[PDB]
Design a protein around this nucleic acid. Structure first.
Ligand code: ZN
Ligand code: ZN
Ligand code: ZN
Length: 85
DNA sequence: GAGGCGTGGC
DNA sequence: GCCACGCCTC
């Protein structure tokens, strides 16, 4: 009942604010700008900008508690964990 | 590993 | 509107 009434889009969202995020696919709007010296990258989604900053910093906050390997995202770790059993 | 994106608690 | 879990497809 939160329908994306742009053009012929068939999409509805269970949350007014997810529709707004989705509308950015039709407008190109990227409100989230990388502030890394001389970089210039921008994103439609804040969490995508977060993943980006992890390239720059090489921060990997997700540490496997069973080996040395670390990850930038939790899903990568979860997938890796399973490989341990 | 990486990008896109649906989602729900806050 | 943040943020982040997590799933999908490559
Ligand atoms: Zn749409
Ligand atoms: Zn950057
Ligand atoms: Zn491990």
């Amino acid at each position: 009942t939160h329908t994306c009434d742009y053009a012929g889009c068939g999409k509805t969202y269970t949350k007014s604010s997810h529709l707004k995020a989705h509308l950015r696919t039709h407008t190109g709007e990227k409100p989230y700008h990388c502030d890394w010296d001389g970089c210039g990258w921008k994103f439609a989604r804040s969490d995508e900008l977060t993943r980006h900053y992890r390239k720059h910093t090489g921060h990997r906050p997700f540490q496997c508690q069973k080996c040395d390997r670390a990850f930038s995202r939790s899903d990568h770790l979860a997938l890796h964990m399973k490989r341990h059993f």
